[PDB]
Amino acid sequence: MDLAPQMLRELQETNAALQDVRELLRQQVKEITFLKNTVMECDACG
Amino acid sequence: MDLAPQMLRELQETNAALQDVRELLRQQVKEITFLKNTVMECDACG
Amino acid sequence: MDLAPQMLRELQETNAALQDVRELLRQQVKEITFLKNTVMECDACG
Amino acid sequence: MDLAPQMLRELQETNAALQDVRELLRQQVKEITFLKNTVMECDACG
Amino acid sequence: MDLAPQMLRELQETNAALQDVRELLRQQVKEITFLKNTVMECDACG
Ligand SMILES: CC1=C(/C=C/C(C)=C/C=C/C(C)=C/CO)C(C)(C)CCC1
């Protein structure tokens, strides 16, 4: 019945949030790759 | 007549959980960004 | 009527999954915050 | 009304994908904790 | 009924984003696995 319009707003907010997890992950991937790079060039390690 | 309310509830339950997942990531990012800086300043490497 | 009970089962499983993912992240953040503190006190970096 | 069969598909796919993300997080923490244990007994930091 | 279709757009969208999150993670894990193997191969630790 009248519950359908909100089901939409919930599926609307489940995408707004996921969109944010989508970019914060792609950021963390870059930061990690970078973290990896600094270690590859670590004289202390050899 | 239908299971619409039980459905509406699960949806909003997916959101509240996504709320926590979104926050844990934001925090985890400040941590990996901090970590990354320490090894760039680490005397032992370069 | 046919798939409605099935659209509820899946939703409930979406949260069960997201429930473990939610508690899985909590542990990852802490391990990562421990690794940071550890690296910080590292007597070779500073 | 018709649209339930197609909506069910998208949900089963949602749980198949999430099904993978769950295990990925279980392995990511697995090695994060090994990375921890590694820097702790690391004779450079002590 | 009236909005049934609009709910299908959102679901399909969460699927797409899930694939993105998914493939981002299999990469982040691929990287963290390297960082682990590398710190283990660090001569500074011994
Ligand atoms: C994609 C998505 C799901 C959420 C997945 C998340 C929130 C994955 C988070 C993974 C984390 C970020 C990994 C951190 O290393 C939900 C269940 C809402 C259903 C449909 C959309």
PDB file of C-alpha atoms and ligand atoms in Angstrom:
ATOM      1  CA  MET A   1       0.000   0.000   0.000  1.00  0.00           C
ATOM      2  CA  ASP A   2       1.378   3.389   1.116  1.00  0.00           C
ATOM      3  CA  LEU A   3       4.657   1.764   2.205  1.00  0.00           C
ATOM      4  CA  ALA A   4       6.089   1.587  -1.321  1.00  0.00           C
ATOM      5  CA  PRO A   5       7.195   5.277  -1.579  1.00  0.00           C
ATOM      6  CA  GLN A   6       9.489   4.901   1.443  1.00  0.00           C
ATOM      7  CA  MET A   7      10.846   1.554   0.251  1.00  0.00           C
ATOM      8  CA  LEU A   8      12.122   3.682  -2.640  1.00  0.00           C
ATOM      9  CA  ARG A   9      13.765   6.275  -0.376  1.00  0.00           C
ATOM     10  CA  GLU A  10      15.472   3.389   1.461  1.00  0.00           C
ATOM     11  CA  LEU A  11      16.744   1.953  -1.855  1.00  0.00           C
ATOM     12  CA  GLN A  12      17.669   5.552  -2.760  1.00  0.00           C
ATOM     13  CA  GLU A  13      19.721   5.997   0.459  1.00  0.00           C
ATOM     14  CA  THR A  14      21.258   2.515   0.096  1.00  0.00           C
ATOM     15  CA  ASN A  15      22.797   3.847  -3.151  1.00  0.00           C
ATOM     16  CA  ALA A  16      23.844   7.283  -1.857  1.00  0.00           C
ATOM     17  CA  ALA A  17      25.788   5.619   0.947  1.00  0.00           C
ATOM     18  CA  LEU A  18      27.234   2.868  -1.230  1.00  0.00           C
ATOM     19  CA  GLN A  19      28.383   5.526  -3.719  1.00  0.00           C
ATOM     20  CA  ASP A  20      30.390   6.968  -0.797  1.00  0.00           C
ATOM     21  CA  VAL A  21      31.853   3.542   0.168  1.00  0.00           C
ATOM     22  CA  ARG A  22      32.744   3.161  -3.513  1.00  0.00           C
ATOM     23  CA  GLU A  23      35.060   6.192  -3.549  1.00  0.00           C
ATOM     24  CA  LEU A  24      36.469   5.868  -0.011  1.00  0.00           C
ATOM     25  CA  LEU A  25      37.554   2.381  -0.984  1.00  0.00           C
ATOM     26  CA  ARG A  26      39.202   3.570  -4.206  1.00  0.00           C
ATOM     27  CA  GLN A  27      41.033   6.169  -2.155  1.00  0.00           C
ATOM     28  CA  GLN A  28      42.238   3.631   0.426  1.00  0.00           C
ATOM     29  CA  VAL A  29      43.446   1.435  -2.435  1.00  0.00           C
ATOM     30  CA  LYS A  30      45.639   4.279  -3.764  1.00  0.00           C
ATOM     31  CA  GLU A  31      46.939   5.162  -0.288  1.00  0.00           C
ATOM     32  CA  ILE A  32      47.785   1.485   0.280  1.00  0.00           C
ATOM     33  CA  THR A  33      49.510   1.091  -3.112  1.00  0.00           C
ATOM     34  CA  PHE A  34      51.503   4.192  -2.159  1.00  0.00           C
ATOM     35  CA  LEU A  35      52.287   2.706   1.220  1.00  0.00           C
ATOM     36  CA  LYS A  36      53.521  -0.315  -0.699  1.00  0.00           C
ATOM     37  CA  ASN A  37      55.729   1.845  -2.907  1.00  0.00           C
ATOM     38  CA  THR A  38      57.520   3.560  -0.005  1.00  0.00           C
ATOM     39  CA  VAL A  39      58.376   0.134   1.422  1.00  0.00           C
ATOM     40  CA  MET A  40      59.753  -1.222  -1.866  1.00  0.00           C
ATOM     41  CA  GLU A  41      62.288   1.602  -1.720  1.00  0.00           C
ATOM     42  CA  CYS A  42      63.259   1.013   1.901  1.00  0.00           C
ATOM     43  CA  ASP A  43      67.046   0.721   2.257  1.00  0.00           C
ATOM     44  CA  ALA A  44      66.614  -0.618   5.801  1.00  0.00           C
ATOM     45  CA  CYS A  45      64.995  -3.682   4.250  1.00  0.00           C
ATOM     46  CA  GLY A  46      67.893  -4.280   1.855  1.00  0.00           C
TER      47      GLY A  46
ATOM     48  CA  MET B   1      -2.376  -8.001   3.314  1.00  0.00           C
ATOM     49  CA  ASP B   2       1.238  -8.455   2.144  1.00  0.00           C
ATOM     50  CA  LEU B   3       4.716  -8.593   3.673  1.00  0.00           C
ATOM     51  CA  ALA B   4       5.495  -4.961   2.728  1.00  0.00           C
ATOM     52  CA  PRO B   5       6.212  -3.758   6.311  1.00  0.00           C
ATOM     53  CA  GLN B   6       8.591  -6.627   7.080  1.00  0.00           C
ATOM     54  CA  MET B   7      10.306  -5.619   3.824  1.00  0.00           C
ATOM     55  CA  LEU B   8      10.448  -1.908   4.628  1.00  0.00           C
ATOM     56  CA  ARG B   9      12.095  -2.834   7.926  1.00  0.00           C
ATOM     57  CA  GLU B  10      14.819  -5.018   6.392  1.00  0.00           C
ATOM     58  CA  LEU B  11      15.638  -2.258   3.933  1.00  0.00           C
ATOM     59  CA  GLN B  12      16.087   0.338   6.700  1.00  0.00           C
ATOM     60  CA  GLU B  13      18.092  -2.310   8.558  1.00  0.00           C
ATOM     61  CA  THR B  14      20.420  -2.483   5.522  1.00  0.00           C
ATOM     62  CA  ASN B  15      20.820   1.290   5.836  1.00  0.00           C
ATOM     63  CA  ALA B  16      21.643   1.496   9.545  1.00  0.00           C
ATOM     64  CA  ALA B  17      24.335  -1.154   8.994  1.00  0.00           C
ATOM     65  CA  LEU B  18      25.658   0.705   5.970  1.00  0.00           C
ATOM     66  CA  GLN B  19      25.841   3.742   8.289  1.00  0.00           C
ATOM     67  CA  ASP B  20      28.307   1.921  10.530  1.00  0.00           C
ATOM     68  CA  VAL B  21      30.235   0.522   7.538  1.00  0.00           C
ATOM     69  CA  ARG B  22      30.546   4.038   6.113  1.00  0.00           C
ATOM     70  CA  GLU B  23      31.907   5.379   9.398  1.00  0.00           C
ATOM     71  CA  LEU B  24      34.358   2.549   9.996  1.00  0.00           C
ATOM     72  CA  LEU B  25      35.844   3.224   6.572  1.00  0.00           C
ATOM     73  CA  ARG B  26      36.193   6.999   7.120  1.00  0.00           C
ATOM     74  CA  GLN B  27      38.070   6.260  10.339  1.00  0.00           C
ATOM     75  CA  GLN B  28      40.173   3.501   8.776  1.00  0.00           C
ATOM     76  CA  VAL B  29      41.196   6.037   6.111  1.00  0.00           C
ATOM     77  CA  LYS B  30      42.583   8.542   8.610  1.00  0.00           C
ATOM     78  CA  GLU B  31      44.569   5.605  10.008  1.00  0.00           C
ATOM     79  CA  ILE B  32      46.108   4.435   6.716  1.00  0.00           C
ATOM     80  CA  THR B  33      46.858   8.057   5.783  1.00  0.00           C
ATOM     81  CA  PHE B  34      48.622   8.483   9.123  1.00  0.00           C
ATOM     82  CA  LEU B  35      50.502   5.168   8.803  1.00  0.00           C
ATOM     83  CA  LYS B  36      51.684   6.139   5.306  1.00  0.00           C
ATOM     84  CA  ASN B  37      53.267   9.358   6.630  1.00  0.00           C
ATOM     85  CA  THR B  38      55.279   7.599   9.360  1.00  0.00           C
ATOM     86  CA  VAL B  39      57.152   5.366   6.908  1.00  0.00           C
ATOM     87  CA  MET B  40      57.888   8.377   4.648  1.00  0.00           C
ATOM     88  CA  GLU B  41      59.565  10.073   7.637  1.00  0.00           C
ATOM     89  CA  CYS B  42      61.155   6.812   8.862  1.00  0.00           C
ATOM     90  CA  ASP B  43      64.908   7.415   9.002  1.00  0.00           C
ATOM     91  CA  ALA B  44      65.659   3.706   8.343  1.00  0.00           C
ATOM     92  CA  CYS B  45      64.491   3.684   4.686  1.00  0.00           C
ATOM     93  CA  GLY B  46      65.625   6.524   2.418  1.00  0.00           C
TER      94      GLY B  46
ATOM     95  CA  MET C   1       2.539 -13.936  -3.649  1.00  0.00           C
ATOM     96  CA  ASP C   2       5.005 -16.247  -5.427  1.00  0.00           C
ATOM     97  CA  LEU C   3       8.296 -14.356  -5.072  1.00  0.00           C
ATOM     98  CA  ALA C   4       7.283 -11.958  -2.240  1.00  0.00           C
ATOM     99  CA  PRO C   5       8.165 -14.479   0.512  1.00  0.00           C
ATOM    100  CA  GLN C   6      11.399 -15.029  -1.465  1.00  0.00           C
ATOM    101  CA  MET C   7      12.114 -11.279  -1.763  1.00  0.00           C
ATOM    102  CA  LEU C   8      12.037 -11.171   2.037  1.00  0.00           C
ATOM    103  CA  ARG C   9      14.330 -14.173   2.549  1.00  0.00           C
ATOM    104  CA  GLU C  10      16.999 -12.617   0.354  1.00  0.00           C
ATOM    105  CA  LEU C  11      16.715  -9.226   2.068  1.00  0.00           C
ATOM    106  CA  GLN C  12      17.167 -10.873   5.479  1.00  0.00           C
ATOM    107  CA  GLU C  13      20.266 -12.607   4.103  1.00  0.00           C
ATOM    108  CA  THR C  14      21.535  -9.231   2.825  1.00  0.00           C
ATOM    109  CA  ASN C  15      21.631  -8.013   6.388  1.00  0.00           C
ATOM    110  CA  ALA C  16      23.096 -11.221   7.842  1.00  0.00           C
ATOM    111  CA  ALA C  17      25.961 -10.828   5.376  1.00  0.00           C
ATOM    112  CA  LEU C  18      26.242  -7.092   6.001  1.00  0.00           C
ATOM    113  CA  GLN C  19      26.141  -7.967   9.699  1.00  0.00           C
ATOM    114  CA  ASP C  20      29.325 -10.041   9.491  1.00  0.00           C
ATOM    115  CA  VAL C  21      30.909  -7.460   7.169  1.00  0.00           C
ATOM    116  CA  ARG C  22      30.065  -4.826   9.781  1.00  0.00           C
ATOM    117  CA  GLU C  23      31.789  -6.711  12.646  1.00  0.00           C
ATOM    118  CA  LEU C  24      34.624  -7.780  10.340  1.00  0.00           C
ATOM    119  CA  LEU C  25      35.490  -4.143   9.635  1.00  0.00           C
ATOM    120  CA  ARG C  26      35.541  -3.299  13.347  1.00  0.00           C
ATOM    121  CA  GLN C  27      38.370  -5.770  13.873  1.00  0.00           C
ATOM    122  CA  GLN C  28      40.248  -4.566  10.796  1.00  0.00           C
ATOM    123  CA  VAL C  29      40.176  -0.968  11.980  1.00  0.00           C
ATOM    124  CA  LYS C  30      41.586  -1.975  15.358  1.00  0.00           C
ATOM    125  CA  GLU C  31      44.348  -4.145  13.860  1.00  0.00           C
ATOM    126  CA  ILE C  32      45.220  -1.204  11.607  1.00  0.00           C
ATOM    127  CA  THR C  33      45.229   1.267  14.535  1.00  0.00           C
ATOM    128  CA  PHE C  34      47.509  -1.123  16.445  1.00  0.00           C
ATOM    129  CA  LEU C  35      49.893  -1.467  13.494  1.00  0.00           C
ATOM    130  CA  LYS C  36      50.080   2.328  13.360  1.00  0.00           C
ATOM    131  CA  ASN C  37      50.888   2.841  17.058  1.00  0.00           C
ATOM    132  CA  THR C  38      53.436  -0.007  16.759  1.00  0.00           C
ATOM    133  CA  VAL C  39      55.167   1.494  13.763  1.00  0.00           C
ATOM    134  CA  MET C  40      55.162   4.859  15.538  1.00  0.00           C
ATOM    135  CA  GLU C  41      57.167   3.693  18.562  1.00  0.00           C
ATOM    136  CA  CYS C  42      59.508   1.866  16.161  1.00  0.00           C
ATOM    137  CA  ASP C  43      63.080   2.676  17.234  1.00  0.00           C
ATOM    138  CA  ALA C  44      64.467   2.972  13.695  1.00  0.00           C
ATOM    139  CA  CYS C  45      61.904   5.352  12.222  1.00  0.00           C
ATOM    140  CA  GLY C  46      60.896   8.224  14.497  1.00  0.00           C
TER     141      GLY C  46
ATOM    142  CA  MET D   1       1.994  -4.534 -11.197  1.00  0.00           C
ATOM    143  CA  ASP D   2       4.351  -7.103 -12.784  1.00  0.00           C
ATOM    144  CA  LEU D   3       8.053  -6.670 -12.009  1.00  0.00           C
ATOM    145  CA  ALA D   4       8.735  -9.153  -9.183  1.00  0.00           C
ATOM    146  CA  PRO D   5      10.586 -11.801 -11.218  1.00  0.00           C
ATOM    147  CA  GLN D   6      13.174  -9.241 -12.410  1.00  0.00           C
ATOM    148  CA  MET D   7      13.529  -7.693  -8.933  1.00  0.00           C
ATOM    149  CA  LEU D   8      14.299 -11.080  -7.410  1.00  0.00           C
ATOM    150  CA  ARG D   9      17.174 -11.588  -9.860  1.00  0.00           C
ATOM    151  CA  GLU D  10      18.823  -8.327  -8.808  1.00  0.00           C
ATOM    152  CA  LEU D  11      18.572  -9.381  -5.162  1.00  0.00           C
ATOM    153  CA  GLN D  12      20.091 -12.850  -5.617  1.00  0.00           C
ATOM    154  CA  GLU D  13      22.905 -11.121  -7.499  1.00  0.00           C
ATOM    155  CA  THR D  14      23.181  -8.625  -4.621  1.00  0.00           C
ATOM    156  CA  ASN D  15      23.756 -11.526  -2.212  1.00  0.00           C
ATOM    157  CA  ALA D  16      26.182 -13.360  -4.529  1.00  0.00           C
ATOM    158  CA  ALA D  17      28.367 -10.263  -4.821  1.00  0.00           C
ATOM    159  CA  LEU D  18      28.080  -9.482  -1.098  1.00  0.00           C
ATOM    160  CA  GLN D  19      28.835 -13.192  -0.549  1.00  0.00           C
ATOM    161  CA  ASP D  20      32.286 -12.587  -2.051  1.00  0.00           C
ATOM    162  CA  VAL D  21      32.988  -9.295  -0.233  1.00  0.00           C
ATOM    163  CA  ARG D  22      32.399 -11.156   3.039  1.00  0.00           C
ATOM    164  CA  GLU D  23      35.223 -13.657   2.405  1.00  0.00           C
ATOM    165  CA  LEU D  24      37.534 -10.944   1.045  1.00  0.00           C
ATOM    166  CA  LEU D  25      37.243  -9.093   4.359  1.00  0.00           C
ATOM    167  CA  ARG D  26      37.952 -12.345   6.284  1.00  0.00           C
ATOM    168  CA  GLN D  27      41.217 -12.817   4.382  1.00  0.00           C
ATOM    169  CA  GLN D  28      42.139  -9.117   4.512  1.00  0.00           C
ATOM    170  CA  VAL D  29      41.954  -9.120   8.309  1.00  0.00           C
ATOM    171  CA  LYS D  30      43.837 -12.449   8.322  1.00  0.00           C
ATOM    172  CA  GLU D  31      46.918 -10.863   6.764  1.00  0.00           C
ATOM    173  CA  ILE D  32      46.500  -7.510   8.490  1.00  0.00           C
ATOM    174  CA  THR D  33      46.953  -9.403  11.756  1.00  0.00           C
ATOM    175  CA  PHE D  34      50.024 -11.244  10.376  1.00  0.00           C
ATOM    176  CA  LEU D  35      51.443  -7.904   9.281  1.00  0.00           C
ATOM    177  CA  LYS D  36      50.921  -6.775  12.856  1.00  0.00           C
ATOM    178  CA  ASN D  37      52.605  -9.800  14.481  1.00  0.00           C
ATOM    179  CA  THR D  38      55.442  -9.188  12.039  1.00  0.00           C
ATOM    180  CA  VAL D  39      56.329  -5.608  13.005  1.00  0.00           C
ATOM    181  CA  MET D  40      56.089  -6.503  16.697  1.00  0.00           C
ATOM    182  CA  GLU D  41      58.869  -9.104  16.718  1.00  0.00           C
ATOM    183  CA  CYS D  42      60.833  -6.970  14.245  1.00  0.00           C
ATOM    184  CA  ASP D  43      64.371  -6.436  15.630  1.00  0.00           C
ATOM    185  CA  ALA D  44      64.535  -3.029  13.920  1.00  0.00           C
ATOM    186  CA  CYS D  45      61.803  -1.526  16.102  1.00  0.00           C
ATOM    187  CA  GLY D  46      63.420  -3.010  19.218  1.00  0.00           C
TER     188      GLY D  46
ATOM    189  CA  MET E   1       2.699  -1.227  -8.925  1.00  0.00           C
ATOM    190  CA  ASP E   2       3.132   2.389 -10.097  1.00  0.00           C
ATOM    191  CA  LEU E   3       6.727   2.654  -8.834  1.00  0.00           C
ATOM    192  CA  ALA E   4       7.728  -1.021  -9.075  1.00  0.00           C
ATOM    193  CA  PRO E   5       9.987  -0.135 -12.078  1.00  0.00           C
ATOM    194  CA  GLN E   6      11.741   2.687 -10.241  1.00  0.00           C
ATOM    195  CA  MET E   7      12.721   0.229  -7.490  1.00  0.00           C
ATOM    196  CA  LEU E   8      14.325  -1.956 -10.135  1.00  0.00           C
ATOM    197  CA  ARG E   9      16.606   0.891 -11.232  1.00  0.00           C
ATOM    198  CA  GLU E  10      17.923   1.318  -7.695  1.00  0.00           C
ATOM    199  CA  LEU E  11      18.497  -2.403  -7.137  1.00  0.00           C
ATOM    200  CA  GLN E  12      20.365  -2.741 -10.429  1.00  0.00           C
ATOM    201  CA  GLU E  13      22.446   0.268  -9.369  1.00  0.00           C
ATOM    202  CA  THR E  14      23.399  -1.342  -6.037  1.00  0.00           C
ATOM    203  CA  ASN E  15      24.499  -4.370  -8.067  1.00  0.00           C
ATOM    204  CA  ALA E  16      26.795  -2.332 -10.260  1.00  0.00           C
ATOM    205  CA  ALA E  17      28.329  -0.565  -7.265  1.00  0.00           C
ATOM    206  CA  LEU E  18      28.709  -3.921  -5.492  1.00  0.00           C
ATOM    207  CA  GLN E  19      30.786  -5.206  -8.413  1.00  0.00           C
ATOM    208  CA  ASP E  20      32.914  -2.043  -8.140  1.00  0.00           C
ATOM    209  CA  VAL E  21      33.372  -2.441  -4.371  1.00  0.00           C
ATOM    210  CA  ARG E  22      34.047  -6.142  -4.999  1.00  0.00           C
ATOM    211  CA  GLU E  23      36.773  -5.741  -7.660  1.00  0.00           C
ATOM    212  CA  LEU E  24      38.329  -2.842  -5.688  1.00  0.00           C
ATOM    213  CA  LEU E  25      38.671  -5.173  -2.705  1.00  0.00           C
ATOM    214  CA  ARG E  26      40.205  -8.105  -4.584  1.00  0.00           C
ATOM    215  CA  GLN E  27      42.820  -5.570  -5.625  1.00  0.00           C
ATOM    216  CA  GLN E  28      43.340  -4.047  -2.177  1.00  0.00           C
ATOM    217  CA  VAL E  29      43.812  -7.548  -0.785  1.00  0.00           C
ATOM    218  CA  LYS E  30      46.165  -8.302  -3.666  1.00  0.00           C
ATOM    219  CA  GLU E  31      48.220  -5.296  -2.520  1.00  0.00           C
ATOM    220  CA  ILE E  32      48.101  -5.942   1.225  1.00  0.00           C
ATOM    221  CA  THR E  33      49.282  -9.507   0.488  1.00  0.00           C
ATOM    222  CA  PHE E  34      52.351  -7.944  -1.119  1.00  0.00           C
ATOM    223  CA  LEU E  35      52.994  -5.547   1.771  1.00  0.00           C
ATOM    224  CA  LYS E  36      52.899  -8.537   4.126  1.00  0.00           C
ATOM    225  CA  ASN E  37      55.284 -10.636   2.057  1.00  0.00           C
ATOM    226  CA  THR E  38      57.598  -7.622   1.788  1.00  0.00           C
ATOM    227  CA  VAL E  39      57.819  -6.724   5.488  1.00  0.00           C
ATOM    228  CA  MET E  40      58.566 -10.408   6.101  1.00  0.00           C
ATOM    229  CA  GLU E  41      61.469 -10.063   3.613  1.00  0.00           C
ATOM    230  CA  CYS E  42      62.866  -6.971   5.360  1.00  0.00           C
ATOM    231  CA  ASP E  43      66.467  -7.417   6.494  1.00  0.00           C
ATOM    232  CA  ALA E  44      66.148  -4.646   9.085  1.00  0.00           C
ATOM    233  CA  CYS E  45      63.956  -6.932  11.222  1.00  0.00           C
ATOM    234  CA  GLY E  46      66.219  -9.983  10.963  1.00  0.00           C
TER     235      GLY E  46
HETATM  236  C1  LIG F   1      27.686  -2.935  -1.896  1.00  0.00           C
HETATM  237  C2  LIG F   1      26.450  -3.179  -1.052  1.00  0.00           C
HETATM  238  C3  LIG F   1      26.463  -3.742   0.206  1.00  0.00           C
HETATM  239  C4  LIG F   1      27.556  -3.177   1.042  1.00  0.00           C
HETATM  240  C5  LIG F   1      28.875  -3.622   0.926  1.00  0.00           C
HETATM  241  C6  LIG F   1      29.869  -2.973   1.795  1.00  0.00           C
HETATM  242  C7  LIG F   1      29.240  -1.876   2.662  1.00  0.00           C
HETATM  243  C8  LIG F   1      31.076  -3.562   1.540  1.00  0.00           C
HETATM  244  C9  LIG F   1      32.088  -2.927   2.388  1.00  0.00           C
HETATM  245  C10 LIG F   1      33.337  -3.467   2.188  1.00  0.00           C
HETATM  246  C11 LIG F   1      34.350  -2.764   2.991  1.00  0.00           C
HETATM  247  C12 LIG F   1      34.442  -1.274   2.620  1.00  0.00           C
HETATM  248  C13 LIG F   1      35.589  -3.325   2.776  1.00  0.00           C
HETATM  249  C14 LIG F   1      36.588  -2.627   3.597  1.00  0.00           C
HETATM  250  O1  LIG F   1      37.823  -3.164   3.402  1.00  0.00           O
HETATM  251  C15 LIG F   1      24.971  -3.771   0.708  1.00  0.00           C
HETATM  252  C16 LIG F   1      24.939  -4.924   1.659  1.00  0.00           C
HETATM  253  C17 LIG F   1      24.381  -2.536   1.378  1.00  0.00           C
HETATM  254  C18 LIG F   1      23.936  -4.300  -0.333  1.00  0.00           C
HETATM  255  C19 LIG F   1      24.054  -3.744  -1.743  1.00  0.00           C
HETATM  256  C20 LIG F   1      25.204  -2.760  -1.859  1.00  0.00           C
END
